[PDB]
Amino acid sequence: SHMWIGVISLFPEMFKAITEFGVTGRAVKHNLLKVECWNPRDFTFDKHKTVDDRPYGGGPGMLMMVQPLRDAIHTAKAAAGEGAKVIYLSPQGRKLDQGGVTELAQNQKLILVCGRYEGIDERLIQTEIDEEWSIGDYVLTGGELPAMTLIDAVARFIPGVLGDGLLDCPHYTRPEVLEGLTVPPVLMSGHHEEIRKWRLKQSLQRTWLRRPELLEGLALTDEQRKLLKEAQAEHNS
Amino acid sequence: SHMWIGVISLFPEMFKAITEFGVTGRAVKHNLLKVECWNPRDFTFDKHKTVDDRPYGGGPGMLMMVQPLRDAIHTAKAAAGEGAKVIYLSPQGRKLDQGGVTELAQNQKLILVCGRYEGIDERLIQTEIDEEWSIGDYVLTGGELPAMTLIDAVARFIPGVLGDGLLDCPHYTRPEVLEGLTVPPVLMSGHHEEIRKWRLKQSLQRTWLRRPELLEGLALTDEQRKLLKEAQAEHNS
Numbered sequence: 001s002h003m004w005i006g007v008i009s010l011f012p013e014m015f016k017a018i019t020e021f022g023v024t025g026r027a028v029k030h031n032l033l034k035v036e037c038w039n040p041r042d043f044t045f046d047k048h049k050t051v052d053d054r055p056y057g058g059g060p061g062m063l064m065m066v067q068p069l070r071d072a073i074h075t076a077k078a079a080a081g082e083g084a085k086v087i088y089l090s091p092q093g094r095k096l097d098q099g100g101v102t103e104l105a106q107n108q109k110l111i112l113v114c115g116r117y118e119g120i121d122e123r124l125i126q127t128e129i130d131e132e133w134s135i136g137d138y139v140l141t142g143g144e145l146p147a148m149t150l151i152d153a154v155a156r157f158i159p160g161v162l163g164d165g166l167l168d169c170p171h172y173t174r175p176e177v178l179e180g181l182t183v184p185p186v187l188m189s190g191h192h193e194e195i196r197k198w199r200l201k202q203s204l205q206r207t208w209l210r211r212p213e214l215l216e217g218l219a220l221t222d223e224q225r226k227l228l229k230e231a232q233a234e235h236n237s
Numbered sequence: 238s239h240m241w242i243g244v245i246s247l248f249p250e251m252f253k254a255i256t257e258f259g260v261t262g263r264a265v266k267h268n269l270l271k272v273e274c275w276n277p278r279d280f281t282f283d284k285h286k287t288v289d290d291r292p293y294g295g296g297p298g299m300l301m302m303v304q305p306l307r308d309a310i311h312t313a314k315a316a317a318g319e320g321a322k323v324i325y326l327s328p329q330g331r332k333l334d335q336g337g338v339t340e341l342a343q344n345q346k347l348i349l350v351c352g353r354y355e356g357i358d359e360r361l362i363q364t365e366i367d368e369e370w371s372i373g374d375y376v377l378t379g380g381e382l383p384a385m386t387l388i389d390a391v392a393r394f395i396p397g398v399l400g401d402g403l404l405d406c407p408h409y410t411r412p413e414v415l416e417g418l419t420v421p422p423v424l425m426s427g428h429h430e431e432i433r434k435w436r437l438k439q440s441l442q443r444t445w446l447r448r449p450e451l452l453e454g455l456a457l458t459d460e461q462r463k464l465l466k467e468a469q470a471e472h473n474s
């Protein structure tokens with residue numbers, strides 16, 4: 001169940017960060033993930049290969065020039081064939097979370113449009129973009145890091161790439177004692193069921209202490225209710 | 238007011254995506270931003286340069302091996318001198334938003350620790366990390382894209398790098414008509430005050446329609462209350 005992702009970007013070499021390294025690098029090498037980039041600069045026709053343009057109404061910044069960006073998008077859509085969802089990365093988009101990742105990962109083909117300067121023409125969003133997505137409520141210099149973030153997150157759902165609403169539990173490895181801090185004995189016990197429950201209780205405790213709002217969205221199992229109650233009682237000494 | 242950012246990563250070449258391209262690339266070239274990387278693999282001593290290790294208690298994955306990671310961190314801290322805040326990137330961290338970016342941007346020195354595999358030993362978080370930060374509620378294969386995201390966001394606050402709680406307004410550039418869609422006449426008017434108010438009204442409308450929770454956190458000006466009321470009346474026809 002491989003995934004094809006088309007990318008529109010003025011800086012396609014940025015995507016080497018995911019295509020050449022680590023788990024995602026391996027996914028690309030093994031043809032589980034295909035990332036293909038089109039650069040608006042290649043679709044310019046003037047001598048200086050101009051990719052920006054002035055905003056109507058004035059303002060300090062520039063926008064992506066429409067014609068090169070539009071042509072790049074059309075070319076990516078033709079390469080993708082039917083069924084590709086076109087996504088624009090911006091702070092105005094739907095905020096990404098793990099549920100959203102799982103939704104996006106159901107697509108066999110995505111096209112990711114990465115804006116630079118002050119963004120892109122609103123009418124291109126109307127005519128060319130299927131969905132707007134944000135990776136978080138903060139502003140970046142370009143849509144490339146958000147696109148790579150999205151790619152990395154969905155790649156984890158592709159079969160062969162890798163080897164429940166709660167924060168992760170603490171993890172420990174060698175040595176047994178590190179600056180006076182010992183590994184919790186239960187993890188040394190070999191008692192698989194005790195270890196499972198300890199890890200689950202830790203996740204529940206950490207979620208409650210750090211991100212209590214996340215618990216509101218969950219229908220806890222009987223076991224989770226019990227372990228959370230235990231953690232909260234211990235916290236209250 | 239330049240910024241120095243130390244990075245601990247098994248894949249330092251990923252950071253070329255921000256140090257070699259665009260606005261952040263220029264910031265690095267102009268010495269406004271300095272990014273310096275240490276690779277735990279360089280601090281290994283065994284023949285096969287091992288950087289992972291088995292989790293106590295079992296489990297499917299691996300963790301970062303403590304000794305090479307710890308030594309890399311210590312080396313970065315020595316290079317940084319006094320006053321560097323050490324940050325670990327993880328989904329268990331404080332969720333990044335623009336207010337958090339502005340807070341982080343007050344630091345002259347940061348050290349960013351990027352985890353791989355299933356993460357790092359909890360005792361290293363206790364002994365070496367000042368703050369844990371997340372870029373959003375989703376899981377990635379590594380902390381590098383979150384680190385670069387953080388770097389990009391804070392870099393925007395460094396003087397010379399670039400040329401209020403609401404979503405951005407729509408932007409338009411040439412041509413005047415695009416697939417039948419016209420530029421809003423106010424933007425062609427040259428009336429700077431009318432354009433300002435239109436843009437502000439659009440931001441208020443878009444925030445209300447897409448992210449109404451964001452408005453709850455704001456103390457709107459009299460002007461903003463008026464324009465939002467107008468937008469909501471127009472929406473209700």
Ligand SMILES: NC(=O)c1ccc(N[C@@H]2CC[C@@H](O)C2)nc1
Nearest residue numbers: 089090115119134135140142146
């Ligand atoms: N939070 C995000 O997902 C995000 C996306 C894009 C972005 N910056 C680009 C620059 C110009 C405009 O296209 C938007 N910043 C943040």
Ligand SMILES: NC(=O)c1ccc(N[C@@H]2CC[C@@H](O)C2)nc1
Nearest residue numbers: 326327352356371372377379383
């Ligand atoms: N949302 C985030 O900021 C984020 C940070 C890290 C991450 N993955 C790394 C891999 C191993 C562990 O160190 C964490 N995923 C997501």
